[model samples]
Target: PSIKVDGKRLWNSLMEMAKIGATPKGGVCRLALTDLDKAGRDLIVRWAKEAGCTVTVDTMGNVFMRRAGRVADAAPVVTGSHADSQPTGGRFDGIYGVLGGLEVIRSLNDHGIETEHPIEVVIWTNEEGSRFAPAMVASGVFAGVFTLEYGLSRKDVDGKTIGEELQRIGYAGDVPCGGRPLHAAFELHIEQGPILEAERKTIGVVTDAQGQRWYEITFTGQEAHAGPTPMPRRRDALLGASRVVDLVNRIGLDHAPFGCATVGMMQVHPNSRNVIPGRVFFTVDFRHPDDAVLAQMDAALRDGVARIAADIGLETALEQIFYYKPVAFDPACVQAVREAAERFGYPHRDIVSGAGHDACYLAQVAPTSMVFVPCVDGISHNEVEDATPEWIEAGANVLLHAMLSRACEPVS
Candidate 1:
């Protein structure tokens, strides 16, 4: 059987959701657990009910909206990404996966198609982790990668726990985070990078995603007068931090095609021109496709930082905050996406995800793969990120068919 989603209907839902935290720059600014986030959640849930789908929210505030299957008891074929965005996020980043799934349901309703396995759409909590401690947290809890207690205990900068916020927003449900059997899963997202557009491809058949490690380092030294202190005698934390920055880029260079390293956040104490720097705090993000190679980078980072602290006579500390191992998606699931794209004659190629996603965590518990469409210039996490209607429509069609292939047949 063949079915296709309504492209204009899909795009309309996107435009509507973009209005929740709509920014002056034509983007969204809905941080996790904020009033804006609550509004967004309310709207989507209302729509799900109107579409004749039953809805459930887990203790972690992960929302699952379902359309019935001919076999009511079969495990659902699931799809979704996240609704939360970065502080200055684009409209299409995580929102597309979510609304795209909703569109699939609406499409099925329009055609009155019935399947053997139930279909579900999940709206994961705090996928950006922008206002919280970690990304993909709710999905991580759903996959058993983290405990319910651990997930609910996650706090924002204001020291508010996810548990507290969930209660306040009336989203904490009685369902435990995980243990539900999932038939299979698919996630559609805009490639936050430039590969697809550069190659003029319409689809990215994501075969795998890279591993990542996040760390924070703090360096401390005695504050001194900048004018009076001799360069040889100064124990400058900022200089030590600077050396680490250069080393970070050097690490990225050493790994070339498959490795990436970045120091995206940094803070200096007393930030004054007349005072020698006494304290510095920064973050390091490293990624690679191979665990062995990622571990090698970790070892190299620890060694480099130690030497820099010793060389500068400054006290230093480093901590690994989080880690996500590289994922090789299920071959069968990957093929579903490939076959769907081929059937439609959309340009596509195998690619590895450069960023972490809820799909990365879901892959731990279900047969999972991702679908990618191009964003103009490979730009994302910015206000101006854009995608053509043709590419978006093409990917959702692939999503529709890939999901249908898994959802229409029952296990004997």
Candidate 2:
């Protein structure tokens, strides 16, 4: 008989974990390395111990809980995600992946089925960049994309270092981060977009994650009295900034169906009631599944912004703050997920991840793939993010079999 995870138990575990940093709006407020984060970590570790897993933490405060296999020396099959949430985050964003792995281990034990290789559930630190900028630092460090010192030295808005917080929470373990071998890795997550829900699909077999480029733009113009300056004569920085916003939106539309452009931040100077705006600063985020298209979008943004600034008589600057290329997951591991979905007869389709995930970094070290279930209206990173229990169950079920396909002998 095929082993299956208990959906009710998994749902209850999620609700219980949600209480640590529960907000008034029925969301979670746990930030990275905060007290609430520690509490949530402690609870998950406690649950892991109960499920017969030996827990270990890394220097970067990444938690790994292992279930020993018949072959002690073989590399382990791993699955998990970060536990941190956005300030007003939903209940099942990152935490679901961590707990879903736990449910898989619990189910395996109930049936007394042992794999050839060990199984590990990992909880990466700070997947939400809300508390610390440049999210996924821990996983990046593990993948050798960044150094351990860089991950430890990251500071929050209040100037508290990640190293200090890890010490404060007593999660500073002796284990070195990464450089270890893994048989395979998988992360189960919500779609975080509208595609699956709109199409009535139960599973998304993630084949790749889109590339991203982040920009910081500034427009400067002379400050003038609003009443004294004629409308055509005014050098309003805000006007140039607004035009750039329109251009960015158009770029997304121009590449429709795959491109995404967002202007999520803006600040205006000169608070005087009647003064013309002197300076405007804003951010731009562009993403696409193809690197060439991302580069094309970059050029368009630069050229469009320059034209808008010149026409408005403003000094403008654009800086590319960050970038990461699109990632194609391991084909063998991806096929494992696809086969699992097919075996269970769950409606599944190949999809690309629109958001960055810790699994994207894990892919650098291990053969990695992701299982995605639909969220309500494809909303996430907000208090109202939601998904159905049936969808959640289907995702974990696929995750369970996928990992099994890698860790054990072939099913007859």
Candidate 3:
């Protein structure tokens, strides 16, 4: 049987929720565990109960709203995303996935459809990490990537811990997080990039989440008067640093379509107009969908940095501070999303996710995949980030069918 969601109803819910942390410039500022976040949670929980779903909050403050199925003890088909927004986050980034899941449940209720496996909508805490360091902590704990103790102890700039904030907001429930089984999982999100819009497609069939590598590099030379230092005698640290920056860009180009490289931060010691820079510290970020490509990029970066430093007669230090291996989502779930998009006649293309999400961590513990819709100019994490009501409706409708494929019908 064919079923669909009330897109207008979903849009209304989103607009109402957006008002809680609504910004003057039209973005949201509900940082994780803040009062604004609590209000947002309260509203969603109330809606969940009104929809006849039982709500449970875990120790990490991860809220699960469940609609029972014919088989009471069966593993559930779960869908959810984080509720917290960046300090200046878009209205549709994380919250879309959460409310989209809720819309699916509400639609099911309206049609009086019963599933073999229960369906659940989760509101993961602290996904933005704008309030705390290291994003997606709550989901990380639920996926067993981080211990409950570690997730609760994370602190914000104000010296407040996640545990403290959860208590203050009355969300620190006794329900233990994770270690339970799930039949499947899906997350619906905006592309947060220009790919879908630029390609004029309606849906992004996400295949993999890109891996990332972070590096800290230091180049040291002697501080000398810029005018007095002869061209042949000067060991310029900034010169070596600038060359490495170009090398990084070229490395990204050499890898082509999927590879990305950026030099996001840098500091020059004794920064002055007339003094040759004595030391330069900079950071490099590299990303790719394939680990092999990431490894190759790593080799290229090390070689390029060494060659540049040696040529300039400067001492150098390099450290790899972080590495996140690429995540390959469950193949069956991937196919479900693609098939649903095809069934609905929505234009779609297979793409890799460029940003980390709660879904990335959930993949560690369950069969997981994500659906994406386009955002204006591929912009997100800012006040002006935008998506159309049409795209929003399209994505949620796809989510509805993809999940129904997994949650409904009989088990042989």
Residue 272 error for model 3, in Å?
3.5
Residue 362 error for model 1, in Å? 1.3
Q: What do the candidate models score in CA lDDT, each in turn? A: 0.92, 0.92, 0.92
Each prediction's TM-score versus the true structure: 0.89, 0.93, 0.96
- In model 2, the runs with Cα more than 4 Å from the true position are 222-232, 269-277, 409-412
lDDT of 2 by residue, 1-412 (tens): 1778899999999989989899999999999999999999999999999999999999999999999988876899999998999998999999999999999999999889899889999999988988887789999988988899999999999999888999999888899999999889999999999989999999999999999999999999989988967889889998899999999999988887789999999999885668888999999999988899999999999999999998989998899999988889999999999999998999999999999999999998899999999999788988888999899889999999999889995322
Question: Once all C-alphas are superposed, what RMSD does model 3 give against the true structure?
Answer: 1.6
Better of 1 and 2 by TM-score: 2
Arrange candidates by lDDT, descending.
Answer: 3, 2, 1
TM-score of 2: 0.93
Q: For residues 37-92, what per-residue lDDT tens digits would candidate 3 score against the true structure?
A: 99999999999999999999999999999999889788999999988898888898
Q: Candidate 2's error at 286, in angstroms?
A: 0.4
Assess candidate 1 and give its lDDT.
0.92
